[PDB]
Amino acid sequence: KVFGRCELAAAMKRHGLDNYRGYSLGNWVCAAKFESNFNTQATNRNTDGSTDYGILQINSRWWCNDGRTPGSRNLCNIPCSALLSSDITASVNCAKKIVSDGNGMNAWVAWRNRCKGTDVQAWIRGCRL
Template sequence: MMHSLALLLLCLPYLAQGYIYTKCELARDLLAENVAKSELHKWVCMAWYESSFNTAAVNQNSPNSVDHGLFQINSYWNCDPQNGKPAKNGCGHPCSDYKNTDLTDDVACIKKLKREHKGWGFSMSYTNNCQSKTSSYISECGIPGLG
């Protein structure tokens, strides 16, 4: 029992870092979450610029606003920080849901934001870095039918 506890304590710093995807792993996982092939490169690019593919990424914007996870979903507008601070929680999830490898809620939230904003305007990372990217951005991933 003590050996297991010691091993767990040794691993905690690594667990806190979350999972860091490769570009192609993320592309395949997003495809499995029904992200359209024609938009896959946009999602992967945005995740790179938002979090460097790290599911546990956190960015403190202001005292009342923190971005969470792979797509940096905002604690004021789009998730509930569950810390007593005001939140709109537009995507209907606690912020902790966006810091794991279950992409179902992340994809649903980003799709909702895309509908509400009629495109990618909600993400400055996308706007500043990904608009000119084409499917060639993920061509090395060997996903049939890209292009």
């Protein structure tokens, strides 16, 4: 599913991601924009053989099981395919663990390089939230 911007903002807010670990909703929408272009089915292979999955490009190196990242962890205790669903619940629940691991949203390179320090509120501007 390719979310609309305000649609994703509303879904993230409903799932408790707005202001989670101090990160406003615009930060999460911006992260999803540049990680996945709002596409829940996004996947990208990393140089180490791991794969990033879903709207927040969560890495099988640590967070989910895809059966093809030998030696990796599954800290969210989910199959990586669950991060590709049209329902964002699994991605949100796992993102909450990631952003709590000590590095905040720096866990998302695209957030650090394209959202951090910018006017992230623009990503929720105009939405009925």
